Amino acid sequence: LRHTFVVADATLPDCPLVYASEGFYAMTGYGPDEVLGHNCRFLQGEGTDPKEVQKIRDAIKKGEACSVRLLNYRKDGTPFWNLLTVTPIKTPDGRVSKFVGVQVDVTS
Ligand SMILES: *[C@@]12=NC3=[C]C([C])=C([C])[C]=C3N([C][C]([O])[C]([O])[C]([O])[C]OP([O])([O])=O)C1=NC(=O)[N]C2=O
């Protein structure tokens, strides 16, 4: 299954991306210069379901894992459907350190 993988830093208050796989750049059209240090929400646009966005926002705050279907947009403006699964990574003290995401393009 063709998938992409990113890492967000949860020690910073707005979860900026700190590592992205070669496919994530190829799929979205953005280079690392425009991805690292930013929140993943730049991928969103008009037809992105705000209720679906809210489930990811809630789970991050509550430190749970979450799986949603989102409409995303490449850098060239064209849309694609992104099955996104975010997973919390905890330190031994139960605190969340990083969030990890698997993104699958499900436009079939
Ligand atoms: C994005 N992938 C992605 C990967 C990780 C590890 C995390 C933590 C989040 C994402 N997002 C969501 C984005 O960062 C943000 O959490 C949401 O927009 C909801 O929060 P807000 O405050 O903005 O409502 C991903 N979002 C995407 O659209 N595409 C992904 O690949």
Swiss-Prot record:
Residues 64-108 form the PAC domain. It comes from the Eukaryota. Residues 1-63 form the PAS domain. Expressed in gametes, pre-gametes and gametes generated by pre-gametes (at protein level). It is found in: Membrane. FMN binds at residues 39-44, 57, 72, 82, 103. Autophosphorylated in response to blue light irradiation. The modification S-4a-FMN cysteine is found at residue 40. Belongs to the protein kinase superfamily. AGC Ser/Thr protein kinase family. Protein kinase that acts as a blue light photoreceptor. Required for non-photochemical quenching (NPQ), a mechanism that converts and dissipates the harmful excess absorbed light energy into heat and protect the photosynthetic apparatus from photo-oxidative damage. Controls the energy-dependent chlorophyll fluorescence quenching (qE) activity of chlorophyll excited states by inducing the expression of the qE effector protein LHCSR3 in high light intensities. This is Phototropin. It comes from Chlamydomonas reinhardtii.
